[PDB]
Amino acid sequence: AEAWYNLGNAYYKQGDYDEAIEYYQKALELDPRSAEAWYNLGNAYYKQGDYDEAIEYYQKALELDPRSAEAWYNLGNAYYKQGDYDEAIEYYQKALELDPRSAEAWYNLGNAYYKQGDYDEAIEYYQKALELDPRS
Ligand SMILES: [Ca+2]
Ligand SMILES: [Ca+2]
Ligand SMILES: [Ca+2]
Ligand SMILES: [Ca+2]
Ligand SMILES: [Ca+2]
Ligand SMILES: [Ca+2]
Ligand SMILES: [Cl-]
Ligand SMILES: [Cl-]
Structure with missing residues (x-):
């Protein structure tokens, strides 16, 4: 194999x-x-x-x-790319339970809330992503 x-x-x-x-x-x-x-x-x-x-x-x-934070994150991404932003949130949350220092997962969780039109939640998650990585 x-x-x-x-x-x-x-x-x-x-x-x-x-x-x-x-x-x-x-x-x-x-x-x-x-x-x-x-x-x-x-x-x-x-x-x-x-x-x-x-x-x-x-x-x-x-x-x-x-315990694959990778599979949970990409599962989130596969819903995000379809415009299924509330499914994306569930799987990004699971990725972040496994890897809470993933700036990528926090950022994409913020993006999903932004796309849902919840800007206050987007702000919280972007602030968390920028605490971990202030370079992008
Ligand atoms: Ca793992
Ligand atoms: Ca087919
Ligand atoms: Ca679809
Ligand atoms: Ca199909
Ligand atoms: Ca389909
Ligand atoms: Ca939806
Ligand atoms: Cl299907
Ligand atoms: Cl569908």
Whole structure:
């Protein structure tokens, strides 16, 4: 499974998402408990704009590794990119329970509230992001 997974990664890194998906699928045929292969399959679908499918595969990754702050964050992002800002908030909150020093997750939580039209909440979360990283 590891060799097919790393072949998929190399294709992913050169932007060949169709081939990455094929080889991640082969990895998952050999090891259906690879949280890494489920996550990277979700990422390849995310890169193609296929958020519905990305969410299915992130959910599988989270069944195997529920302490994946990464999967929770990208699951949030897959809803955010669709305009599903209240779903995004739930998964950014879960990412931040696991990694409360993630300036990225706080910032994106603020962005979701901004997009919901709650500017006072956006301000709180942006202030938290800027406390952790005042450079952007
Ligand atoms: Ca669909
Ligand atoms: Ca849909
Ligand atoms: Ca489809
Ligand atoms: Ca983890
Ligand atoms: Ca949609
Ligand atoms: Ca909504
Ligand atoms: Cl769906
Ligand atoms: Cl929908």
